[PDB]
RNA sequence: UUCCGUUAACGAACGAGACCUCAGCCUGCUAACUAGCUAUGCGGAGCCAUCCCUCCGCAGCUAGCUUCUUAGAGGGACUAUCGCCGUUUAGGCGACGGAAGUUUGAGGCAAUAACAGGUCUGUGAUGCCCUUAGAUGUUCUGGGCCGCACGCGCGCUACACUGAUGUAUUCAACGAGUAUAUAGCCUUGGCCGACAGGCCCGGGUAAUCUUGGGAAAUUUCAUCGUGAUGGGGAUAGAUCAUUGCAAUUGUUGGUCUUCAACGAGGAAUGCCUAGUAAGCGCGAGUCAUCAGCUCGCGUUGACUACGUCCCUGCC
């Protein structure tokens, strides 16, 4: 029984902005499993981190979105 | 029937067919029906050359005890002029010119 | 280095360690270098012709399961590409070498027929390795948020190391064990 | 340890259903050690088998 | 992305029905009986409600406009071919039946046929199929 | 000559139809009339598939009957007189010759 | 660069650029039934893109650019797809004719596509020019 | 299984028996003369007779055969 | 006799299943298009490298003096790409055979052959007809007892 | 029972194969205003004008031509060549070449002798028996063949993210089609309509018009986010159209709503060795209307084996 959240709380936003950019592979599935968030929230958080420039993009596709860290 | 079918066979073979076959099915003598074949000569049954070499008919006799069936299959000979029979020789037939 | 998989990955630096499993993985010879894991090849007319088929293609063909995925080879090639990129991301090595290592560290070498323990031939060895790898990835992906490409990448990476955290390696171990118990 | 032995001659499909192949192999470190082992899967003359236990052999044509 | 809101409500008591706040508003409105995905989509568009939001994200006023549209699709210009009660028997008025009123209309429509001894009403009363299907091997 | 003549030929057999067509195009090329043809239309395959059993017992076995219609078009430029003088030779049975005058 | 016609650019990008062009031009009048209708009866939801009208206008403009003589039934077949029939096998189905006709008439009220005597619709010289001058702006 | 039937085999030995002289070791030359000293009712059957004739014509060179080939 | 002829035109086709692609080659500047669109846009995109293989192997330098216009019809979205592949390969081989000396043809044909014989020789495989008694060519109706 | 080989048998015949059809190859041949290509001319657009180049449209029975399409004739493979095995036979395996090397693939046809096999409800095929005017004839009306505690067989739809949904996008083949009466069949185009459908001009008895068959799966982007959930769509309510003489026991097609089981299935058991299985759609037959069925078609396209008599059956 998944209890994935659909909206971040401020602490989880801080962890998304700090610990997540330290992840090697960044895809919506990994973020959903780790941060305990929905896949929609995962995709949107990945887009925001791509807006703040805290990640790179290795490959984008409809089925699989693959992102990695710039640092 | 056993005397008319052999007569038909006789006439066909004197006419010149390479082979002839007659089948009589029905209540010939008893109440149970049986089938009497009257074959003489060479007759092919399979392949395309059947629908070139086999002239066949199926006719009923409307008798007092019921219906009697007649299958007559006449196998024709290869006619180079294509009048008495087929003009195409049988596929397996091979002729070697003598030296 | 003219022919590269997806025009992004080199074939020349692939080392197939096992001498036994060398003629049944088609990666080393230049004749077995392909741009795409898609050939529409006739590798089934003869008994030992699937051995001369590129190994990435043999991995790709096992992804067209089950019946709902039968014949969908372009989607399988897409999964292979997205798996080979995750492999390069998480290992920083050539994904073809990770794949050949996983196929080497996954094929069972001994089995129990009839219950006499028999040894597996190289061709059945690579067939079993590929079957276990893709079966484990598919069962990991089923009813899971994780994508089939990510599950395939994780399974291949854990099989290349030799870790018992990969379904294929656990299953290879069971298979060979039953051929040790029933020696 | 793991002995690698190269198939030199294939003789017979054994088992009730022919699921196993009886074969002769000369070992890779001992080209004078010729053993009859049973193989599961398609096998041909020249493929190397990693016979894990290389002492048991097998009964010919069984 | 969007972080959160102090007003985010997980359960919203809507038309005597519970709506999950962790659901997109369009599919969240399909919790009330009588509202399907297509009618909820029309209701969300006509009420000028963001379709990329979640049910809990909306405020009081937004759901009030959603209910203005749900209780009167006509004033909000929802065509009459879009209603689940077109040309009512007694009334003759087009309307969108929602909530427990759907069950009420079902029961009244069945009682109407169960008093006139119509075939279909008797099929309903016997617990058998009413739309002319074979009953020998299926429906067991 | 003056007008444009389209002779359509149809048949169920290829040899009879082709030899009739050869006769027509040979006659056309003897009287020095230009001939465009024969032009072979795609063959029509009339197909009937029916259960061979006269009843509903046995393995449901199906015989597929086919009738193949072969169409040939010959396009001359001439007057009607030479056209009916050409298409008056012995047209073999099964061949349906049809003459139509164009502009 | 420029000097690229429609049959030089990726269709997915050209349609997106030309829909934006059409929306900017402001010469498109939208029907009342833009937020209600479905593009086909086999569809179960209205288009999820608010600018779907302009996207479909760009799509049909490009199709008329590449081919001449497409009628409303032809465009119903072009935008028709697979219908899922519940417990029954799927079959092909056709799209809505009102949407195609209205968008084509809106595109006649811009001098982009006219109607040919031979039947269907042709691309006008102005429409060809517009599509070709937008294709040059599409990044390669 | 590519086993030749009697009609192919019998014709092969009869052709070599009579026309051994005008018979070469090449299939393509033997299938041309086979059209001049015989009347076969199929190209497929003519090819099989000439391919087995060439086969026999090479075993004769080996030296033992069970035909006659007086010579 | 031993001089190169004036560069001209060749037309070559490739086939896969029922798809046929015909490449028209004329002296030009290296343009390659399929049904008017450039080949660098052919779809599916993840089979794009399959159609690029003859060009990637013969090198883009071997295509400078020719313009390749390819018309493809029939088949599906995979067989058309595999047909365009073979059309490009056979068109380059024929162009080098009539206007660019036999040796260079031989070299380019050898490269194509060592990579894939399908680049030059069509696969003869076609759909097998359905038989009554099953829903497929080999598959039979489920048997009960 | 295909040959070889052994031999009181030799020589034949049917059957098998041969044969026939479809498919695979032919830049050789024959020929295309009901098929195209290429070039030329003109026109449109782009670029910027023109020119050139690129993409289009139109025209030319004096623009050529047949690669692509068609369809006739032929050719082409024979295991032919090589190695190995084999009694060094008959044959098998591997290899080059080759379109094709698995008698190339798939069919059609298909012996002797049978079975109390099915069919008298296909037959104006039928013996005998029954009935024959208050008919077991015929016709008309209405009902039933659909009825539902239950058991079994063939199936379709699913259980989902290798997905559903909504965009964008673009590849088949087999076939079918009219009595023109205002009009009958296949329907193009225009208009009205959200759909369903309707109205109005027409084409086609057909490589000519429908139809270059604008098939889906697939592809692309986005949403959904592991939740019986936007999976599934059974059941059910209201309502609108169409076929028909007639739609209730819902013909069917739409619209809104309703939103069941089902989370991969026990013991069992079916089919299948390559363009095959499986997936996907199309056409035809049935047909006024109704295809979850059959008979065909193409699209996407594998795994596994190249054996054995363990089971099942047959010899
Ligand atoms: K009968
Ligand atoms: K009777
Ligand atoms: K009947
Ligand atoms: Mg036969
Ligand atoms: Mg998953
Ligand atoms: Mg219409
Ligand atoms: Mg389906
Ligand atoms: Mg030709
Ligand atoms: Mg009986
Ligand atoms: Mg019944
Ligand atoms: Mg979709
Ligand atoms: Mg649900
Ligand atoms: Mg659904
Ligand atoms: Mg009915
Ligand atoms: Mg039908
Ligand atoms: Mg069985």
Residue numbers in the entry:
A (entry chain Z): 36 to 106
B (entry chain F): 115 to 213
C (entry chain P): 10 to 123, 132 to 200
D (entry chain c): 4 to 65
E (entry chain S): 2 to 141
F (entry chain U): 24 to 126
G (entry chain T): 14 to 153
H (entry chain h): 2 to 72
Paper text:
Ribosome is a molecular machine that translates genomic information into the amino acid sequence. While the large ribosomal subunit functions only as a part of a whole ribosome, participating in the elongation of a protein chain, the small subunit has extra functions, being responsible for the initiation of translation and for the recycling of ribosomes after termination. We report a high-resolution (2.3–2.5 Å) cryo-EM reconstruction of the Triticum aestivum (common wheat) 40S ribosomal subunit.
The most prominent mode of internal mobility of the small ribosomal subunit is the relative movement of its “head” and “body” domains, usually referred to as “swiveling” and “tilting” of the head (see for a detailed definition). The processing of the subunit as a solid body results in poor resolution of the head domain. Interestingly, the most protruding “beak” part of the head domain is much better resolved in the map of the isolated plant 40S subunit than in a complete 80S ribosome, free or translating. This allowed us to significantly enhance the structure of ribosomal proteins eS12 and eS31 and to clarify their interactions with 18S rRNA and each other. Interestingly, a nucleotide corresponding to G1531 is absent in the 18S rRNAs of tomato and tobacco ribosomes, and the relevant part of rRNA models reveals significant rearrangements. This deletion might be compelled by the need for tight interaction with N-terminal parts of eS19 and uS9 ribosomal proteins, which exhibit divergent species-dependent amino acid sequences. The first three latent coordinates correspond to the mobility of the head domain. Coordinates 1 and 2 match swivel motion, while coordinate 3 defines as tilting. The bimodality of the swivel motion makes it clear that in the case of an isolated 40S subunit, rotation of the head domain is a complex two-dimensional process. Here, we demonstrated that in the case of the isolated 40S subunit, the various modes of head motion are weakly correlated.
